[PDB]
Design a protein around this ligand. Sequence first.
Ligand SMILES: Nc1ncnc2c1ncn2[C@@H]1O[C@H](CSCC[C@H](N)C(=O)O)[C@@H](O)[C@H]1O
Ligand SMILES: Nc1ncnc2c1ncn2[C@@H]1O[C@H](CSCC[C@H](N)C(=O)O)[C@@H](O)[C@H]1O
Ligand SMILES: Nc1ncnc2c1ncn2[C@@H]1O[C@H](CSCC[C@H](N)C(=O)O)[C@@H](O)[C@H]1O
Ligand SMILES: Nc1ncnc2c1ncn2[C@@H]1O[C@H](CSCC[C@H](N)C(=O)O)[C@@H](O)[C@H]1O
Ligand SMILES: Nc1ncnc2c1ncn2[C@@H]1O[C@H](CSCC[C@H](N)C(=O)O)[C@@H](O)[C@H]1O
Ligand SMILES: Nc1ncnc2c1ncn2[C@@H]1O[C@H](CSCC[C@H](N)C(=O)O)[C@@H](O)[C@H]1O
Ligand SMILES: Nc1ncnc2c1ncn2[C@@H]1O[C@H](CSCC[C@H](N)C(=O)O)[C@@H](O)[C@H]1O
Lengths: 251, 251, 251, 251, 251, 251, 251
Amino acid sequence: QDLRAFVHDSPEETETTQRLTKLLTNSPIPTEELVNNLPLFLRRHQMTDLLSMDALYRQVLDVPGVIMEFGVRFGRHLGTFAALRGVYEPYNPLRRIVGFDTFTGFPDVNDVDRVGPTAYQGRFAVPGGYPAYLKEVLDAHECSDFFGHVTQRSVLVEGDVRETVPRYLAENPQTVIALAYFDLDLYEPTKAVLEAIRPYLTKGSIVAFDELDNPKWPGENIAMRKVLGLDHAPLRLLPGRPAPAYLRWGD
Amino acid sequence: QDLRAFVHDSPEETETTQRLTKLLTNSPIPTEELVNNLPLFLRRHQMTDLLSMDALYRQVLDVPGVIMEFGVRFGRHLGTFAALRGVYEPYNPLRRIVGFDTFTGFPDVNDVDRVGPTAYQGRFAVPGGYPAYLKEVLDAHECSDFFGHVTQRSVLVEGDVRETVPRYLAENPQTVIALAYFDLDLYEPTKAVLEAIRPYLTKGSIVAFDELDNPKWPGENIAMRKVLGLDHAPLRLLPGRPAPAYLRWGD
Amino acid sequence: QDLRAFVHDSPEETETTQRLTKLLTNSPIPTEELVNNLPLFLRRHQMTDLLSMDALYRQVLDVPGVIMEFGVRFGRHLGTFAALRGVYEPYNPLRRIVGFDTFTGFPDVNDVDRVGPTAYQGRFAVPGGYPAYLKEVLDAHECSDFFGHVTQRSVLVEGDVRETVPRYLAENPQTVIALAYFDLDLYEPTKAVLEAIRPYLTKGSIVAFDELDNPKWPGENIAMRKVLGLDHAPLRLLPGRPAPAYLRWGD
Amino acid sequence: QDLRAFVHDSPEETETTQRLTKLLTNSPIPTEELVNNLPLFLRRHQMTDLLSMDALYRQVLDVPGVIMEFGVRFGRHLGTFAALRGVYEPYNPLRRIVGFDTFTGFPDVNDVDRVGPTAYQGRFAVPGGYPAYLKEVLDAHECSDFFGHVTQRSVLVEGDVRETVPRYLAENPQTVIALAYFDLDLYEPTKAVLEAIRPYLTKGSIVAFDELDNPKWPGENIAMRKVLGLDHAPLRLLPGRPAPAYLRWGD
Amino acid sequence: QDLRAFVHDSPEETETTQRLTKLLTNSPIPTEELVNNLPLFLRRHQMTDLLSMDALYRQVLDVPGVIMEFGVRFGRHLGTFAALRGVYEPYNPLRRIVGFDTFTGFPDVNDVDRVGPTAYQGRFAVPGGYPAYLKEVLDAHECSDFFGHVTQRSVLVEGDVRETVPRYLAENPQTVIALAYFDLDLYEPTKAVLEAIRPYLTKGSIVAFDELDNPKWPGENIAMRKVLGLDHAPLRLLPGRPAPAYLRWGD
Amino acid sequence: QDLRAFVHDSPEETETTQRLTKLLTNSPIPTEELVNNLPLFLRRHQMTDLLSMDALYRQVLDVPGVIMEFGVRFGRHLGTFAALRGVYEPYNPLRRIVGFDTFTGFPDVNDVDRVGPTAYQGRFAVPGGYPAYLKEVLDAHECSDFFGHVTQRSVLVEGDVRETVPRYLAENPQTVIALAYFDLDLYEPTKAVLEAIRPYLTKGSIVAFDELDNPKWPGENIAMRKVLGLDHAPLRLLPGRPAPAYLRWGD
Amino acid sequence: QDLRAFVHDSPEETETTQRLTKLLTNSPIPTEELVNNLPLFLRRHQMTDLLSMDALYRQVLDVPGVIMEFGVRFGRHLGTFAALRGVYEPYNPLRRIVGFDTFTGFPDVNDVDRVGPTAYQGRFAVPGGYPAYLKEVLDAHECSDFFGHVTQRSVLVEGDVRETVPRYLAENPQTVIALAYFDLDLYEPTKAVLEAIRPYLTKGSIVAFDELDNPKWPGENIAMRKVLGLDHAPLRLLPGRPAPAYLRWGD
Ligand SMILES: Nc1ncnc2c1ncn2[C@@H]1O[C@H](CSCC[C@H](N)C(=O)O)[C@@H](O)[C@H]1O
Ligand SMILES: Nc1ncnc2c1ncn2[C@@H]1O[C@H](CSCC[C@H](N)C(=O)O)[C@@H](O)[C@H]1O
Ligand SMILES: Nc1ncnc2c1ncn2[C@@H]1O[C@H](CSCC[C@H](N)C(=O)O)[C@@H](O)[C@H]1O
Ligand SMILES: Nc1ncnc2c1ncn2[C@@H]1O[C@H](CSCC[C@H](N)C(=O)O)[C@@H](O)[C@H]1O
Ligand SMILES: Nc1ncnc2c1ncn2[C@@H]1O[C@H](CSCC[C@H](N)C(=O)O)[C@@H](O)[C@H]1O
Ligand SMILES: Nc1ncnc2c1ncn2[C@@H]1O[C@H](CSCC[C@H](N)C(=O)O)[C@@H](O)[C@H]1O
Ligand SMILES: Nc1ncnc2c1ncn2[C@@H]1O[C@H](CSCC[C@H](N)C(=O)O)[C@@H](O)[C@H]1O
């Protein structure tokens, strides 16, 4: 296998990324103004991810239910949703944001996922004790929400989605899922979650995938073709971006 | 169970409510002008409910049939509908408003309902002889409707909806249901009412829930997933408001 | 001489008002729940007013600036605006609501105003100390706004608008007027104020009149025709309602 | 029972109707000008019926086939369609108007039809010889049609629709039905006619009902639910009018 | 001088009119059912007139102000408007209907008016005391209006419009004109009224002419060209009908 | 059976037709300019047919495939199509126009076709040698088409469609049918051709009938009801015209 | 000067025209059926001219007034208009069709018209006595109009437009011009008529030119630029066709 056939950063993207890291970490901005100037360090690729999440969220503002992410890593998307929920929904204490991850990286891989060299147990592990920090970040956002006095509006569920997702659902019979964001990369957990969330979607719910047509991670495609079929609903892109691919339930 | 995980009033929301109550009861406004200045005392949260009811009503203006509320309490919504019916349909004597309730609170609760501390029989009980008072309120509105001379345009049906709803439908084979507003909280009566009203709905009829995705009251969701499925039709919010969740039958 | 040629309440309308008044003041609803059930006592005519204000507010949600009402009486419209502002603009602390009145009724009437038997000095006077009460009412609402910590978001200006409006404007050079609601009834103050607010309107600003084509109060029409002409912009009704008459500046 | 729960004329509506009747029959208008000033005597309620037939007619101008009314009485609607056909379709000699009736009133009633005190044999009977008069009225209209030389564009079919409708259809195999207006009030004949006309409807054909949700006449509702179901197509009102309820075949 | 170049009735139109006149005045329909069956006698030409007036009325439903007709004769249009005001605006007691006429025919004529042989003083005169009968007819309609207790909602002003229209305006300074219907036929009075009404129109008000391009009555055209110019606004027809021609002020 | 109940020419339509014919054959127009002034001799009824053909054709400009007429006679529609194909599709040599006919009138007739007097064998026959002449007419048109070097873009298929249509289809397996125009009048061949063309239609293809609801030729209706059902797709008129009736395949 | 740089018939276009002429004059079609089969002989170029006239007429269906063609020749467009008026406006006897021509060719050419070899006096002359034949053709159409009893609905005005157009307008003060079709080719008359018709156009009136940007006839352009300017209104093509160029008055 030629590693260059997989999507990877150009020398230029790496340099931009490194330079911005340096300028953030060695900034002459007074410390208490840094969080007021973050777009200085938010480059095209990452800006694009933010704008995509906003696009997805704007499509479920008239749909009841919660937002769910499978595959959280450091929580980039969860931070986005928490901010976006403040922007769009000050008066919606029921828009719960729920993140699922082992927080210890890939639990185990299936043969179908072994395409490139990063398909191994432990990949994307974040540091020990990470969830408590991420929760602390989320709580910092919620502190100034109109419904900040209501708790469990952000929830991190730690462990294998194959177990945690059905358990979460059993414990929350009130669930409707407005937006389901799949970023697991792996075939087995994707398939299992797709199956479990099905009774809690309504027509109009968004199902989104981070890696559906990526050669390095065919698992999500394989899972989709198995549980539903690629033409079960219309899979769409936000024009100009390879990801996410997303569908509107019932369409 | 942490009670703060359930939606509850902020201290400032309580304060607003309490101050407005006091300013309503101790007012330099002549008593004869109070009903000409009610918005002085109608805070955001309740104004929102009024706007929501108006929004749902406007969606059934071209749909034949009647308006039904399952779960009335003091009758806030019934009064709204009566006023709105005047605004929109002076020439429609067949737009009957029917409110079902025990008027003695929750008759009995199912296991699935006991998530929180208010899940007891008698909860939301209104005083003795309340239905007659509400009838007087409704009559007072209708007294100046264009079709005020026609009776039973507002009907209060006392008792368990498990029997009163099939009984009302039986006594009224002419029924078409334009708007079904569900506020029963409990699994059992919701399921029963859903099943009973189904043959009286047309494509375009609105079925609306007050608590579809509230952790405190999962019985409406459980009932929905049992009788119909969350994706039977597109469930929707009016953007910015946790509730009602509503669907357009047949969509 | 024929007073029936002026709009007045039918016997039934009078009946509705008195009855609902009686039912409000002698309600079995626990006193602390009354402000949660105000629609019971909100009749068609008043509901219509509320819906109209909402319709006007919605037309300026993408227009910067403040809301001004000229002629407040007990503050029916100010309460409405204050609640709607919570509904629509939790994050807009610049949307100031400004009500102008003598609060002692008509200060001095012109001959053109003297069409009916109620065009007298001091007509619509409210009790001494009223502005402080109304301010308490508005403070009560603002208590639980997202930006409740910011003061002077509701301002009552007491005096003859012929002097107080130009003074307010001179004191607030940041002013842009999104919504100007005219409810003074009288020719001279309407003329004066129409002239003064003009440099503070943008294309898209709404100017509304409560009695533009009412035989009993021709002053607003007379003022309009003299200052701008009736075809300066398109004057509109919300269909089904004799009032308000409103125009979008620049259309 | 209490008859006042049934839709009935107000004292004022009765007054309007009697006054207009007297003003028509005892008028200073020259006799040859009466038919040029009919709207003087056409009150809101009957104007509404006319505007409704017009709205229904306009929806089938792009649909091939004939117009049928079941339940003609004096022929109010037949006169309307004959005029409207002139307005919109000078060049369509195939737009046949067919009216069915006993012209001797209700032939017999089912038990479900006996809610009110008018549900007996002979009800709504028209005098002997009436059909021949009604044909005179129709012929009079057609005399000035562009296709006035083509006979049988208006047809009165006398008898019980249970027999006459299928008979008419068998004798007319070219039939397409663009508009079917149901005004029989009773259950069994509505049911029979519904089942009969089905093979002659196209998608877009209008099926309309005068009494679908009237408590006094539940037969049409019962028939509809028995034959098709209330959610077979979207049943609709023209906004602000209790009747007719109509559907677009295939929607 | 060919009279067949003027629009006149065909033999068939004449026959239809005569027959319907006979069938109306010699009807076997019970006297109390006549005004429930008037469309039996309303032929194409007149039905067309009715639908045209309805079309114009619908275009001013969101325009404040009154309806004026200049040239009333027997009042066909006034009756139409009275019914239509009921259909569309039960809650607008300010929609005054004002009809201007000598009620004794053409007061005098101009030479430009003398194209055909019906341009003589007294043409279209109605019997003595006619305004009292027409007022009785209008009062009959209003008797059952929601705002029936408000008087002078219909006004017949007798005299030459050249003086009566400016006098009406001077006495009613609250006037906005939503719909102005010119049916005077003659140049001079049309000219004078067009000039008088102008300060009372808003953008969106409708001005309609019954005979704008009629070779028999060039008066309205000459007047229009003199006062405004034919391209002052877009003059329009309702497709398929020679009259009325109308414009939306300001367009 | 009254023959006046079938559509037939009025005396005036006959007169117009006979006059135009005489004016054509006895024209002072120079012979070589006649084909530049044909609209002089094209009356309303025939102009309408042309506009209808153009309307149907415009609906299939984005649909692949050929144009078929069943029932050609002298070739009126084939000539229209040839010219229209020039107007809209100079660059489409695959838009073949195929006309089927015996060219000897009806080959037989069924009992259901025998409603009128002209339902006999050989009705609508054209002279011996006629197809060769018609072919000469079409070749003249194609001579100046952009793709006039490609042959068989117009094809006359002589014989009974019961045999020739399936034979044509077997010989042309590339066939898609964009527009199928039925003008056979008769039950049996309509039925046969309807079944045969089905596999060659796409969603969007237009099926059109010239006689669908004509009492004199109920065969096409009988065929439709038997093969597809009148509600298989929406049958449509071009407003104002009794015919064609046409449907969009798959709607 | 190269005459090839002017638009002219290709050999194939010439061949088509001559063949069709031959086939029309030696046709086996029974003489009485010729006028039922004209599209056989209507080639693309001529079909195109008909569809454009139809497109133009369709755009003035809601505009009052008459249709004028300046430059009639053999009357092709007038025939088209007569028939289209039948298709679209059976009920509009005021839609006068007025054609102006010398009927003896170009009266005299300006120097700016002498670009090609056909720019000479007498060019396009029609036989002596032609107008009576054309009128007889027009009368033939009108014979079967709904308003056929109204005369002068077609007018041929013989003479020089510089004199006849102003005379016609002076004699017809009721004139509104819905559609003005310029086909004079020459500068002087085009300028004169443009100036003359202006006071009779309304906003929406269509002004169309047959030779606006034709090198061989620059006279219409020169006149447009002198009288109004090319950017007075938006000049438009029906896409695909070099002519007509048309504008919508007031756009
Ligand atoms: N079976 C499973 N259960 C829980 N998490 C899983 C899982 N399989 C994969 N994951 C998680 O999916 C994540 C993929 S990385 C996703 C986050 C993304 N990089 C962002 O910044 O937005 C990893 O953290 C991995 O631990
Ligand atoms: N089985 C049952 N039959 C009748 N009423 C029931 C019921 N189960 C619950 N309810 C009622 O549901 C109500 C919920 S409180 C909802 C009312 C609220 N004020 C509003 O505006 O709609 C209670 O009053 C309770 O008595
Ligand atoms: N010149 C002036 N200066 C200040 N207030 C004036 C004024 N002229 C009239 N007003 C006020 O205009 C008011 C009219 S009543 C307004 C009613 C109120 N907006 C409601 O919704 O109920 C009176 O209070 C009167 O005092
Ligand atoms: N079985 C049946 N067969 C024929 N006519 C019937 C019938 N049952 C009821 N009807 C007729 O239905 C009619 C209802 S009254 C219809 C009123 C009329 N359409 C209008 O617009 O005014 C009666 O005339 C009655 O004779
Ligand atoms: N100067 C004037 N003052 C008042 N009326 C005038 C007038 N000049 C003409 N008229 C009136 O214009 C009328 C024209 S006939 C109007 C008919 C009526 N609009 C209908 O719908 O049937 C006549 O009644 C005539 O009296
Ligand atoms: N079974 C059959 N097979 C082939 N042609 C048939 C047929 N039945 C009827 N036809 C033909 O259908 C034609 C009907 S006349 C249709 C032609 C019309 N002028 C037009 O513009 O299209 C006749 O020519 C007849 O010969
Ligand atoms: N000054 C003038 N007065 C009257 N007619 C004129 C004219 N100048 C040119 N014409 C006429 O304009 C015509 C141009 S040919 C017109 C062709 C025609 N419109 C068609 O559709 O076939 C000629 O007949 C010519 O006589």
